[PDB]
Amino acid sequence: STAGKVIKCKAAVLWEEKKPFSIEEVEVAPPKAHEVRIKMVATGICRSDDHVVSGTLVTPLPVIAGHEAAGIVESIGEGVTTVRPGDKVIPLFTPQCGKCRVCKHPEGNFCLKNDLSMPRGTMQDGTSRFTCRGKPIHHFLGTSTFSQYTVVDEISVAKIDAASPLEKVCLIGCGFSTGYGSAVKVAKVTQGSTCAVFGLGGVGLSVIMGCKAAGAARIIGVDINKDKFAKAKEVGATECVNPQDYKKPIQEVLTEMSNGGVDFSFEVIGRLDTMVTALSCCQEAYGVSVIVGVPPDSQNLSMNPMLLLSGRTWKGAIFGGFKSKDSVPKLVADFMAKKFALDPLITHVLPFEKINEGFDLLRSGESIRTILTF
Amino acid sequence: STAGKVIKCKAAVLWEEKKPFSIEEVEVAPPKAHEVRIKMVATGICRSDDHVVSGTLVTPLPVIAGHEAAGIVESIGEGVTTVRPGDKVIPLFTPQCGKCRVCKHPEGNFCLKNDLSMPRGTMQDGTSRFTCRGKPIHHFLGTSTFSQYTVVDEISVAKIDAASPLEKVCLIGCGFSTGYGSAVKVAKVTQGSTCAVFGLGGVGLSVIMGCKAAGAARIIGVDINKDKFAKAKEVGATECVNPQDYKKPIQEVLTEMSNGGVDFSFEVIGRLDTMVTALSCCQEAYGVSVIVGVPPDSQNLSMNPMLLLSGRTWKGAIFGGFKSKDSVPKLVADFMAKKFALDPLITHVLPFEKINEGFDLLRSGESIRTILTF
Ligand SMILES: NC(=O)c1csc([C@@H]2O[C@H](COP(=O)(O)CP(=O)(O)OC[C@H]3O[C@@H](n4cnc5c(N)ncnc54)[C@H](O)[C@@H]3O)[C@@H](O)[C@H]2O)n1
Ligand SMILES: NC(=O)c1csc([C@@H]2O[C@H](COP(=O)(O)CP(=O)(O)OC[C@H]3O[C@@H](n4cnc5c(N)ncnc54)[C@H](O)[C@@H]3O)[C@@H](O)[C@H]2O)n1
Ligand SMILES: [Zn+2]
Ligand SMILES: [Zn+2]
Ligand SMILES: [Zn+2]
Ligand SMILES: [Zn+2]
């Protein structure tokens, strides 16, 4: 039925920052050319969604948030090649437009049609496919996955394995792929290496997995919160260190530990102090350090250029440096091949109406990942 | 004759910081095992020598400075394989001990027996091969090339082409190799790229050459001093920009200029402001920025981690990232093959007694490179 007609469904609208989400009856306009309209099956709650609500991530409001998700294609607009109705898909918040500077370049993945650099909160043609009582609602990072139906451009949707468990592969739409990509594709962790992962939330557990996929022979997990160590161990940390156990610095007790500093170091905490710390405790002449994520209101860090002079490399990346359309298929194919288990990372699944309930957990921190089922 | 006996020669001694060099009669003890004693032919004056004299580079005084140089082997101590008397050689201030962490690693070059990290000012066994009137004089970075004869360990000497012009290949002992290595071996400048070189002193002209050897199709030279542009052009700058010409920022007028920021950017000025500037104007999703050199008294820069988040890489290196024993031979072989010309970079050659005269020029800056002939 639906094909061609507007749909009317529930979605969570942030009418204004620092207020809760409201479940609203929403109308989802039909796809124009090169658009696909998706039926959502499961959406993860990521801190970047919550960043919107504090005003930290400035995007046009009112907004439908969500970017981590898998669903099923309902209609496809005119001129769409990549997908067909009924295909399981993952919305992509890093688009893969194919034609730009960054898209042709063999290591750039951060597509030039991204809506992060300057958020407009619209579809590629400057308009919204959403209205709640006449009022337009903005799109978020071209995905808006906290809606029961959503419309994405063809550069922001990736087709995946029809037998794939959508209540687990939705993690590949952001959180797992951002961390595993940092170990596997951005730092290019090598077999035998000694990796230090800073912070052990769900993206950190993904990094540990990357390191493990790459064959590091030592993955030290570090966290001031002792309670994170078991799951980390479970997922690949050979050891785990709590910074408040020592009297010494941590970069000292890590280089000491490692006979000269670790090969690769990753910061999945997101703060300034440990970013620079994570620089100093990877090897002086060839250590590589990846800032997996940095929050939207970041200030300037003070770092002494001298730490680069001996040969350290310092990289940053969005989405694990993966080219989105290219990789999310292969990461599901892999998950289907029984390599990663997204299972240790899912600690709560709620129904989609408990969206605000899913954020309170995020915000008090005992939740690795919450999945919202539709 | 000499072989085995102490030699007595003139060398320039820094008896104490922030004083001039004195030509002193010096005695050069014979080589112990794995030492070679060199007869100096030409030594370049580098700012790192001058850094010693201000106290900025702290090393034990009294000292014989010098590290950029080529000479001829006079005796070789017991157990020396790599060299024979009469071989033209280049002292290496970055040793290549063969056995360590950094020496086996396929990209680390900063040997673990380096005397920069913690200067002792001695030969590898904790002692000096120099005494001026009974008083011991310290060795500098295991080279001490401002002496008419010097003793170096076998890990710090590289054999080169016997037909090689030593009054020009002495530059490969530091200044040229530090800059060309940054473009060729550290950033790995690719064919077609757009490079921005910051600062256009002699190391900067070397970078321009690297970029040129790598095949960049645009090398923008930038310098507040207009007068540096011709030689730069001459050596490969396709254009040159003076920052005081614009009203805009320079990273803006460079990314603007480059349709999205340059591929590779290099800072050969050595200050904090342009290091961070040179970060921002190479491409957001895959731009690479190399700090070629950072002075010894460096403070902390303030940089917003956000510039790494999109995919920029920021590297530092010592000696152009080259493994010293390995490469200095191949860089002479290349120079012998009429590829680089060290000639644009040599702007003054003095006799070795005018050492202080050679530094005043360094210090007022109109001198690309001064060579001191022995
Ligand atoms: N904003 C971003 O783009 C982004 C990506 S990752 C990131 C940071 O990570 C969080 C999301 O990633 P995540 O899955 O790890 C969730 P979380 O916020 O739980 O990540 C932080 C982790 O670091 C640990 N920790 C906190 N401070 C220290 C410290 N000083 N030293 C050592 N360990 C510490 C915490 O226990 C936690 O495990 C965000 O809240 C933010 O703080 N921000
Ligand atoms: N200490 C180190 O390890 C090291 C390596 S390179 C380096 C810096 O470079 C010098 C040695 O290298 P070099 O051959 O280039 C000699 P120089 O000191 O001449 O290098 C600095 C160059 O940058 C230019 N310049 C100065 N400020 C600016 C500015 N703000 N913006 C743009 N251009 C500017 C100068 O005209 C000059 O050409 C050292 O004095 C130091 O200042 N230090
Ligand atoms: Zn996210
Ligand atoms: Zn693109
Ligand atoms: Zn030097
Ligand atoms: Zn070594």
From Swiss-Prot, chains A, B:
Positions with a binding annotation for Zn(2+) 2: C97, C100, C103, C111
Cell location: Cytoplasm
Gene Ontology, cellular component aspect: cytosol
Binding site for Zn(2+) 1: C46, S48, H67, C174
Catalytic activity: a primary alcohol + NAD(+) = an aldehyde + NADH + H(+); a secondary alcohol + NAD(+) = a ketone + NADH + H(+)
Top-level taxon in the UniProt lineage: Eukaryota
GO molecular function, one term: all-trans-retinol dehydrogenase (NAD+) activity
N-acetylserine found at: S1
Residues annotated as binding an alcohol: S48, H67
Cofactors (names): Zn(2+)
Matches recorded under InterPro entries: ADH-like_C (IPR013149), ADH-like_N (IPR013154), ADH_Zn_CS (IPR002328), GroES-like_sf (IPR011032), NAD(P)-bd_dom_sf (IPR036291), PKS_ER (IPR020843)
Gene3D superfamilies from the UniProt entry: Medium-chain alcohol dehydrogenases, catalytic domain (3.90.180.10), NAD(P)-binding Rossmann-like Domain (3.40.50.720)
Protein residues bound to NAD(+): S48, G199, L200, G201, G202, V203, G204, D223, K228, V292, G293, V294, F319, R369
Documented EC number(s): 1.1.1.1
Keyword list, A-Z: Acetylation, Cytoplasm, Metal-binding, NAD, Oxidoreductase, Zinc
Family affiliation: Belongs to the zinc-containing alcohol dehydrogenase family. Class-I subfamily.
The protein's assembly and partners: Dimer of identical or non-identical chains of two types (E and S) coded by 2 separate genes at different loci.
Protein name as catalogued: Alcohol dehydrogenase E chain
Source species of the chain: Equus caballus (Horse)
